[PDB]
Amino acid sequence: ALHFLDINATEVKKYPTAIQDIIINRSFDGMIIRGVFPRDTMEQVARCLEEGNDGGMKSILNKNEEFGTKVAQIYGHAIVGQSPDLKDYFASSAIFRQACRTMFQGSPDFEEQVESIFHSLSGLPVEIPTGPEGQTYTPATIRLLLEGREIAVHVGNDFLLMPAANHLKTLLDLSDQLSYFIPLTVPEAGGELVVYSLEWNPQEASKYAQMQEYMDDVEFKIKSNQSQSVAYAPGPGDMLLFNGGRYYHRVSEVIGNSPRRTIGGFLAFSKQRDKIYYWS
Ligand SMILES: [C-]#[N+][C@@H]1[C@@H]2c3c([nH]c4ccccc34)C(C)(C)[C@H]2CC[C@@]1(C)CC
Ligand SMILES: O=C(O)CCC(=O)C(=O)O
Ligand SMILES: [Cl-]
Ligand SMILES: [Fe+2]
Numbered sequence: 001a002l003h004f005l006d007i008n009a010t011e012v013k014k015y016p017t018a019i020q021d022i023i024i025n026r027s028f029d030g031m032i033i034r035g036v037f038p039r040d041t042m043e044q045v046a047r048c049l050e051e052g053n054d055g056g057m058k059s060i061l062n063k064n065e066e067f068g069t070k071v072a073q074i075y076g077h078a079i080v081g082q083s084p085d086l087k088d089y090f091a092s093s094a095i096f097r098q099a100c101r102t103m104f105q106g107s108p109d110f111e112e113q114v115e116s117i118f119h120s121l122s123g124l125p126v127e128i129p130t131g132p133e134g135q136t137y138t139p140a141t142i143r144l145l146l147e148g149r150e151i152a153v154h155v156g157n158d159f160l161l162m163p164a165a166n167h168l169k170t171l172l173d174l175s176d177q178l179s180y181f182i183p184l185t186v187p188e189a190g191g192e193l194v195v196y197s198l199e200w201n202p203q204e205a206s207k208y209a210q211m212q213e214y215m216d217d218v219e220f221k222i223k224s225n226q227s228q229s230v231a232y233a234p235g236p237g238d239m240l241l242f243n244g245g246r247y248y249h250r251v252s253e254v255i256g257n258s259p260r261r262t263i264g265g266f267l268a269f270s271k272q273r274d275k276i277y278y279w280s
Pocket of ligand 3: 156157
């Protein structure tokens with residue numbers, strides 16, 4: 001039901017309004033972009049993490065043990081669930097950027113390459129957002145899914161309703177936010193991005209007595225009947241760029257000894273629509 005383009009990284013400049021067309025015009029819902037990073041680069045970065053020679057990335061690993069099976073471990077603080085002051089977020093974000101820059105060894109640089117893609121798909125300048133007093137946001141977090149683990153169903157636009165987003169809302173236009181991620185390592189089986197046709201609907205959610213009741217309905221609505229879905233398994237160095245702000249989605253259980261490792265985040269238009277911000 002959902003329409004995705006499947007293109008190679010070298011063809012991106014032939015789609016100079018792809019981000020506009022996904023968010024504003026809504027003519028299609030996502031993109032696989034093949035070979036944004038070389039496989040050598042992906043394996044180099046995977047080894048750094050595995051070895052511990054990771055530019056200090058393991059010093060900002062959040063295991064999320066208090067939460068259950070339905071959640072990845074995350075290198076760097078994800079903005080989702082943070083307090084609106086973002087002090088811990090800004091500290092870990094500064095560490096992430098430096099550590100990630102070192103691991104990629106400018107071959108190519110993660111930030112430069114990801115920004116190159118987003119520029120090519122929009123014709124606009126691209127920036128990592130900056131805090132109230134100049135503090136850097138993080139462009140991405142690295143998500144680690146071990147065997148048996150998954151990422152529970154969720155929708156991206158709920159972020160706008162969180163305290164964490166109070167600063168970003170001053171900078172962002174309130175159109176849909178996209179999700180992006182590149183696998184560093186893929187598992188033997190499972191760990192697929194499942195995108196459903198069930199859409200974000202805060203109007204419906206407020207009619208319930210609380211969000212607890214609304215997500216319980218959404219969960220039973222999605223498993224498994226009244227919603228079409230599509231699954232994706234990008235390879236190492238492929239970007240999956242899609243409207244996760246609008247569409248409910250999840251990552252299926254990882255099967256096998258090899259963990260799923262992705263580097264990713266989100267993007268959206270600036271208030272003025274003359275710029276793209278990306279972050280995690
Ligand atoms: C995993 N993960 C992220 C989100 C996340 C969730 N629950 C968490 C609990 C504690 C820390 C993070 C999360 C949900 C299921 C909303 C996850 C959505 C996607 C993330 C990888 C990043 C925003
Ligand atoms: O696999 C990942 O890194 C995140 C998947 C996801 O929920 C998203 O891209 O929004
Ligand atoms: Cl999302
Ligand atoms: Fe998501």
